[PDB]
PDB file of C-alpha atoms in Angstrom:
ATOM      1  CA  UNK A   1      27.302   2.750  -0.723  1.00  0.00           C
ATOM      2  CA  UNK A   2      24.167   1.609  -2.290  1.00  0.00           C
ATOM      3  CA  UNK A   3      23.056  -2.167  -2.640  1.00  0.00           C
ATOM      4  CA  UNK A   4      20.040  -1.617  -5.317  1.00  0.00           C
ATOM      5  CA  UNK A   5      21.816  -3.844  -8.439  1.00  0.00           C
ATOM      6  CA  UNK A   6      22.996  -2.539 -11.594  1.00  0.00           C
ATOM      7  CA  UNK A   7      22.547   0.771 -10.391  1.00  0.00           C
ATOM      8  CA  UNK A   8      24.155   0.672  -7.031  1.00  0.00           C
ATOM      9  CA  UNK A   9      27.219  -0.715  -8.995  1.00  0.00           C
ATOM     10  CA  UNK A  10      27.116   2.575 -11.233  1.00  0.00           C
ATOM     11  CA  UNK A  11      26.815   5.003  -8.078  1.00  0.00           C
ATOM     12  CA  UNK A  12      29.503   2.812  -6.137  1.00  0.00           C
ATOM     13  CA  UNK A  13      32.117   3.391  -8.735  1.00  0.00           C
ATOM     14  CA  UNK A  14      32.107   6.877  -8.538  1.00  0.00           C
ATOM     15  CA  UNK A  15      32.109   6.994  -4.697  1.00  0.00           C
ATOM     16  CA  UNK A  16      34.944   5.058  -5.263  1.00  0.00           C
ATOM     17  CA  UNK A  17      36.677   7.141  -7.421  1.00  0.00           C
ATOM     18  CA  UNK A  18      35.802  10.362  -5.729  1.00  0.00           C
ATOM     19  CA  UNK A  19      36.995   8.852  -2.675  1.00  0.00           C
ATOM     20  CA  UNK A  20      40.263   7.782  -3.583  1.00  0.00           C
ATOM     21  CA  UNK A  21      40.869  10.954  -5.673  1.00  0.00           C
ATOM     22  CA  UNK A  22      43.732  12.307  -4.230  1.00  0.00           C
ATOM     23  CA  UNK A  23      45.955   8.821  -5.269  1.00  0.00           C
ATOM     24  CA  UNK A  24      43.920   8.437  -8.533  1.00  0.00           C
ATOM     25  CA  UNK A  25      44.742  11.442 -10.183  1.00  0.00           C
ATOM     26  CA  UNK A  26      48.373  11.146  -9.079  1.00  0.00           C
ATOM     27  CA  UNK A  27      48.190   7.396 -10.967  1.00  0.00           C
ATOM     28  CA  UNK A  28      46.450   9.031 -13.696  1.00  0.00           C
ATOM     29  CA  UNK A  29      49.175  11.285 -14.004  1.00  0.00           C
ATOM     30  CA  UNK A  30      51.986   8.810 -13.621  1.00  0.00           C
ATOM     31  CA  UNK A  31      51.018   5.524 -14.419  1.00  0.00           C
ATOM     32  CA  UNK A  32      47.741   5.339 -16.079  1.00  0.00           C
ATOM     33  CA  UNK A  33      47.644   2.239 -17.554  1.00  0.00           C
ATOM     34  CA  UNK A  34      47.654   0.846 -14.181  1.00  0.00           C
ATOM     35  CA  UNK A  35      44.910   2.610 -12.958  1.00  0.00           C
ATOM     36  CA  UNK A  36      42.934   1.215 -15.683  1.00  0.00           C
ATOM     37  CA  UNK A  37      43.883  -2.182 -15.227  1.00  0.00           C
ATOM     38  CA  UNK A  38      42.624  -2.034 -11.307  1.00  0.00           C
ATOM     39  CA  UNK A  39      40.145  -4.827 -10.246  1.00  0.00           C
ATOM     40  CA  UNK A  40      38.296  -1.806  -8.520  1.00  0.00           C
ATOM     41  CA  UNK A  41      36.873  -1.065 -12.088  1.00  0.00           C
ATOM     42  CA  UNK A  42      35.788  -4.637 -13.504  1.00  0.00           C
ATOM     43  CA  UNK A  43      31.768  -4.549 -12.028  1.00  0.00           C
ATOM     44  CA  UNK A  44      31.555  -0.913 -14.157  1.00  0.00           C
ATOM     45  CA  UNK A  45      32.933  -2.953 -17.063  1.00  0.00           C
ATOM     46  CA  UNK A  46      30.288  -5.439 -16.886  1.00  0.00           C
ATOM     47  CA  UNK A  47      27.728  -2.947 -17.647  1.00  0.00           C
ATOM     48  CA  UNK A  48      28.962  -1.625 -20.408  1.00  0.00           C
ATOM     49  CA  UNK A  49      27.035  -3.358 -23.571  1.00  0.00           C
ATOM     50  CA  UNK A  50      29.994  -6.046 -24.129  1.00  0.00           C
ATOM     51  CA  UNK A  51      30.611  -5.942 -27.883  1.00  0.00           C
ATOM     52  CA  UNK A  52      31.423  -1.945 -27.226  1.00  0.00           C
ATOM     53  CA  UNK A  53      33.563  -1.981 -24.116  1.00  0.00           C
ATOM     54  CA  UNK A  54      36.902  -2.577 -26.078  1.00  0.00           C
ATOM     55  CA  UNK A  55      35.464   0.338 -28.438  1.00  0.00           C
ATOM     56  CA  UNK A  56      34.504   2.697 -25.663  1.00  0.00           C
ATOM     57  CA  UNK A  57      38.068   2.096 -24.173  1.00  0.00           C
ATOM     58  CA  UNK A  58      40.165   2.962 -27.076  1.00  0.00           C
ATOM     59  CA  UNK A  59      38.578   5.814 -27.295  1.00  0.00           C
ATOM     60  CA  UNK A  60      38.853   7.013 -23.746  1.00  0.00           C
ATOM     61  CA  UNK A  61      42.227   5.822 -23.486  1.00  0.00           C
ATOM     62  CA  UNK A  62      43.172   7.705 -26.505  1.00  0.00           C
ATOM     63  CA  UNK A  63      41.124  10.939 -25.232  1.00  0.00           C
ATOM     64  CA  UNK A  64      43.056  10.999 -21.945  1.00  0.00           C
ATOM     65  CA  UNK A  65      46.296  10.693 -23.798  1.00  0.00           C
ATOM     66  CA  UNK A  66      45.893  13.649 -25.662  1.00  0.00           C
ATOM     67  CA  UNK A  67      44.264  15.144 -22.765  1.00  0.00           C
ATOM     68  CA  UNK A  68      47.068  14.556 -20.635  1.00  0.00           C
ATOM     69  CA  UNK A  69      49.568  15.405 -23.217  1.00  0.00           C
ATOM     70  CA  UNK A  70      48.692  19.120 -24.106  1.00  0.00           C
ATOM     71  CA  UNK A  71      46.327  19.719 -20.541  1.00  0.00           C
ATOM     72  CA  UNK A  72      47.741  17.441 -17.554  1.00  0.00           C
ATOM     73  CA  UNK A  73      44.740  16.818 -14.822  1.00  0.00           C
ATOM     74  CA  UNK A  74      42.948  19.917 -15.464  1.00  0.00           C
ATOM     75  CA  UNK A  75      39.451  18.453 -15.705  1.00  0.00           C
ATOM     76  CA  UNK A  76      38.562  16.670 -12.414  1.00  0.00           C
ATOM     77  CA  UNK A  77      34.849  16.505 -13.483  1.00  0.00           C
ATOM     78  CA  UNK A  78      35.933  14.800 -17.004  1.00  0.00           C
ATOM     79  CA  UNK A  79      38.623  12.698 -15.551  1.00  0.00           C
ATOM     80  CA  UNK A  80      36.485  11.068 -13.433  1.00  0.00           C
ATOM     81  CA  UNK A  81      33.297  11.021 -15.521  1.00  0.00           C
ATOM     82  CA  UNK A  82      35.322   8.938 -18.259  1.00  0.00           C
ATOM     83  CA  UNK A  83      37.694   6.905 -16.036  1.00  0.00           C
ATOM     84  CA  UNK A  84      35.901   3.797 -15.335  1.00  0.00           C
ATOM     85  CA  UNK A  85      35.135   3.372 -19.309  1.00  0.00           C
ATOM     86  CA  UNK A  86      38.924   2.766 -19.738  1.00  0.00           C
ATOM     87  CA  UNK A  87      39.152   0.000 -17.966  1.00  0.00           C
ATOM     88  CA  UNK A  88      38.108  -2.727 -20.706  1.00  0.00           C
ATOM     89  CA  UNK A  89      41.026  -3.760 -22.693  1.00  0.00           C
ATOM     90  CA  UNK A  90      41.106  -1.198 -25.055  1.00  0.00           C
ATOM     91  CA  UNK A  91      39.953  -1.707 -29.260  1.00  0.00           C
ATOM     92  CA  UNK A  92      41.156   0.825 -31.247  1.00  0.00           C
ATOM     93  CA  UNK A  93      38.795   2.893 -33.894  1.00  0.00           C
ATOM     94  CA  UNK A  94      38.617   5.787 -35.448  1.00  0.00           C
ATOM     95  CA  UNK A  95      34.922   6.341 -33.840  1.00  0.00           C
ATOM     96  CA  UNK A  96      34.135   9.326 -31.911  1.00  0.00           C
ATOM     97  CA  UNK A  97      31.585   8.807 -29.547  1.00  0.00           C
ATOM     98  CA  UNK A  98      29.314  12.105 -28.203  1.00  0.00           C
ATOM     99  CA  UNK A  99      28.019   9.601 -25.231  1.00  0.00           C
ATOM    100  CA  UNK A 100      28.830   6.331 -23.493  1.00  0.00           C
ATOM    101  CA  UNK A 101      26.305   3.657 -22.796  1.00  0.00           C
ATOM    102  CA  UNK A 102      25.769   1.651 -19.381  1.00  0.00           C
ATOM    103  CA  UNK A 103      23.040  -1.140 -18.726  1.00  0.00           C
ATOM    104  CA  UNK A 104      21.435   0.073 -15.821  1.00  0.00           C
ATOM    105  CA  UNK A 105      20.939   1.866 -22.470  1.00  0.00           C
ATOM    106  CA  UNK A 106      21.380   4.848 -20.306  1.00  0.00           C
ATOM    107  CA  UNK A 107      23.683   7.308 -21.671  1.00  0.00           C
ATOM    108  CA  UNK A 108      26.776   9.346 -20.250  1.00  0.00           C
ATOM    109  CA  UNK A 109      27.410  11.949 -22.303  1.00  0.00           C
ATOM    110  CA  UNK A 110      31.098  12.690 -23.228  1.00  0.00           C
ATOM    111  CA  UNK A 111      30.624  16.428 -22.768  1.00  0.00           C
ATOM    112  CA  UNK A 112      27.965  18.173 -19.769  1.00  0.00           C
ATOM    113  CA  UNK A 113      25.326  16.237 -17.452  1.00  0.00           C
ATOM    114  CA  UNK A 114      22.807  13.431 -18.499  1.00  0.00           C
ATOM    115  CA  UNK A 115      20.432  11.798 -16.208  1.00  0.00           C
ATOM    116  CA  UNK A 116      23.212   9.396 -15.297  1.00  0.00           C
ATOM    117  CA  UNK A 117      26.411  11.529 -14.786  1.00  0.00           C
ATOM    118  CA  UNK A 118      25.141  14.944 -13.062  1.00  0.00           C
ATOM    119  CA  UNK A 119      27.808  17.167 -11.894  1.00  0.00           C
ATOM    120  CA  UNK A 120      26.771  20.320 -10.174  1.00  0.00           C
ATOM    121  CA  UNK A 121      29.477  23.424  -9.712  1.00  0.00           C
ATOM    122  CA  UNK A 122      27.094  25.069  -7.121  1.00  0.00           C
ATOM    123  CA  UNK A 123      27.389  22.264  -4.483  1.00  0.00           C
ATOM    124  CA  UNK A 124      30.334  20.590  -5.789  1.00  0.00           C
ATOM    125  CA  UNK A 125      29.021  17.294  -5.781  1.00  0.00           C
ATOM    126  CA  UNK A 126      28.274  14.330  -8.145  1.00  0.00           C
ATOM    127  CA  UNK A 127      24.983  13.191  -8.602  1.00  0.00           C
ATOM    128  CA  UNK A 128      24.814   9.301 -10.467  1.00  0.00           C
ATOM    129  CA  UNK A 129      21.165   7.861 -11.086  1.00  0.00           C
ATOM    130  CA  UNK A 130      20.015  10.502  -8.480  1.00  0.00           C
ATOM    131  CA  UNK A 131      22.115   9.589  -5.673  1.00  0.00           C
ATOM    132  CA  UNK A 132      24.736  11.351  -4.639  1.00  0.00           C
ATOM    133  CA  UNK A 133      28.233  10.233  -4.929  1.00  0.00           C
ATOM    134  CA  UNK A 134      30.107  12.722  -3.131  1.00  0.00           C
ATOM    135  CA  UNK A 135      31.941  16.176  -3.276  1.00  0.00           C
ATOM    136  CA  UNK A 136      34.328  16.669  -6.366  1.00  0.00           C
ATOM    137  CA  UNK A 137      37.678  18.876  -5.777  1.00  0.00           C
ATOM    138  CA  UNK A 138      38.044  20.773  -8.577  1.00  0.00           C
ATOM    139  CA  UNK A 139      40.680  23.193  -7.663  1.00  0.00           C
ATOM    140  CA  UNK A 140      43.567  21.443  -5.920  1.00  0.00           C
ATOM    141  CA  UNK A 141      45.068  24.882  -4.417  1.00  0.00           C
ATOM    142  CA  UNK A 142      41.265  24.621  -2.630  1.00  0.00           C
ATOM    143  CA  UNK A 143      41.395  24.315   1.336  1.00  0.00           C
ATOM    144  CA  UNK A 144      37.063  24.491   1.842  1.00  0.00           C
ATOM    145  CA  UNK A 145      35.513  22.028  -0.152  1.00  0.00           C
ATOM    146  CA  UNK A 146      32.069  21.656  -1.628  1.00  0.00           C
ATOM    147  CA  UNK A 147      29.023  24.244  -1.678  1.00  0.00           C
ATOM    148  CA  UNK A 148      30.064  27.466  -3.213  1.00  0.00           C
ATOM    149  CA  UNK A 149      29.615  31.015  -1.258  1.00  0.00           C
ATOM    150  CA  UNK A 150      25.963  33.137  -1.598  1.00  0.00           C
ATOM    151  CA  UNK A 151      23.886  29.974  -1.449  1.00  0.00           C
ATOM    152  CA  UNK A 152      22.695  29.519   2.229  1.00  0.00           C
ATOM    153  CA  UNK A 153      21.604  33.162   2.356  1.00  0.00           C
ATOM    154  CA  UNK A 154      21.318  32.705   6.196  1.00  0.00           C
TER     155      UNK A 154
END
């Protein structure tokens, strides 16, 4: 884990969440709400700009409903990406947001990478703020994790 403030908070989350993958996307599956609700989140909800947290969580909330609805946990990468942003109690709106801001404004965008949020499906790991915060399962049938064949060409 990293220790350098608002940053170290942003990267720490997402170790977090990558760590504990295997029971959060079962809880995301089952019981959702709960997830949301966990203390584990609350230091990620701090940095989100407080007069849009409620905003930001409606609409995440709402977006993972539908998700799960018509997709189940398809989308590791997104799952993750957008979980922490749920945890707020939620304010519904009719807004659709393209990106999510965190005071470390930086901007996670909704869809793809941003300097904050950087995903890469060659290694299999996530990148946050430029540090890394671990390897990402995207294909649950997987047994060999992270960096993809024909890259160390010796």
């Amino acid at each position: 884990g990293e220790i350098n403030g608002p940053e170290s908070v942003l990267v720490n989350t997402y170790q977090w969440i990558i760590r504990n993958w295997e029971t959060v996307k079962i809880q995301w599956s089952q019981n959702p709400t709960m997830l949301y609700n966990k203390m584990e989140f609350e230091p990620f909800q701090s940095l989100v700009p407080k007069a849009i947290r409620g905003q930001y969580s409606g609409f995440v909330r709402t977006l993972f409903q539908q998700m799960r609805d018509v997709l189940g946990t398809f989308d590791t990468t997104q799952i993750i990406k957008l979980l922490p942003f749920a945890a707020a109690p939620p304010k519904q709106s009719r807004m659709q947001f393209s990106s999510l801001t965190v005071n470390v404004g930086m901007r996670i965008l909704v869809r793809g990478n941003s300097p904050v949020f950087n995903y890469n499906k060659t290694t299999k790991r996530l990148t946050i703020l430029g540090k890394d915060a671990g390897t990402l399962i995207e294909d649950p049938d997987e047994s060999t994790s992270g960096v993809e064949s024909a890259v160390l060409r010796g």
